[PDB]
Amino acid sequence: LSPKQMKREILGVLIEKSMESKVCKIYEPLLSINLGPVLHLKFYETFLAQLAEMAIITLDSFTINMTNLHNCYRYIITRFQSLINVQIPQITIKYSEIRNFCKLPLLSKKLILQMCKHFLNTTHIGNLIDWWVDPTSEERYKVFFTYS
Numbered sequence: 001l002s003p004k005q006m007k008r009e010i011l012g013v014l015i016e017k018s019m020e021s022k023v024c025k026i027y028e029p030l031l032s033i034n035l036g037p038v039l040h041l042k043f044y045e046t047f048l049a050q051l052a053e054m055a056i057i058t059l060d061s062f063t064i065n066m067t068n069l070h071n072c073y074r075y076i077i078t079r080f081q082s083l084i085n086v087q088i089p090q091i092t093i094k095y096s097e098i099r100n101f102c103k104l105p106l107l108s109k110k111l112i113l114q115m116c117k118h119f120l121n122t123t124h125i126g127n128l129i130d131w132w133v134d135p136t137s138e139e140r141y142k143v144f145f146t147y148s
Contacts, residue, residue, distance in 0.1 A: 001038070007047055008114050009033060014057070015073055015118050018066035026064050054106040072102040076119050083145070084126035090144045092136075113141060 001009070013029045026048070033039045048064070051057045056072060058065040075098065083091055098112050099105050113133055120131045120143075130146035 003043070006039065006043065010039075010044065010047055011051075011111070011114055012118050014051070014064070014066060014069060015115065017064075018070040018073065022067050022070050023063050023065050025062060026059065029064075051111075054108060054111065055104060056107060056111065068102070068104060072098065072104060072107070073115055073119070075102055076115055080116070080119055080123070081125060083143075084123070084128050087127070087147050088145060090142055092140055092142045094140055096139065109135065109141075116143065 010029055010033065013032060017024045017029065030039060030041070030044050048057070048059055051069075052059050056068045058067075095107075095109050095112055099107050113135060117133055120128075120133075127147045128145060129148050132144045133141060134144070135141045
């Protein structure tokens with residue numbers, strides 16, 4: 001598990017916790033990851049602060065508020081569900097689009113791509129069977145879809 005790979009792990013858990021409820025206890029992601037020490041506290045705390053610095057979550061003494069995370073991931077679901085049902089081969093998206101639509105200017109490219117990959121890795125709906133994400137421009141990425 002590289003540090004990037006671990007960050008994506010935490011992010012994935014947060015994404016799923018946020019679809020269940022917009023707040024959870026700060027230790028819960030740490031708890032579940034250390035059962036599926038695998039994850040040291042200092043690393044976890046640091047990554048949380050970085051997501052808070054991008055305003056996609058906010059941290060309290062005992063809770064993670066994931067409102068923006070839930071909202072932004074809902075946009076991605078809605079956007080990508082809508083692409084699968086038209087069965088588009090490929091699409092090109094500006095990082096600025098997710099940022100503007102969600103009103104989250106500080107979202108990084110890395111975070112945006114990891115949320116999109118989390119959705120495609122997790123979606124069941126549609127005749128989708130393969131996908132690929134290609135970060136092309138500094139302002140754009142492309143997604144390729146496969147239908148059966």
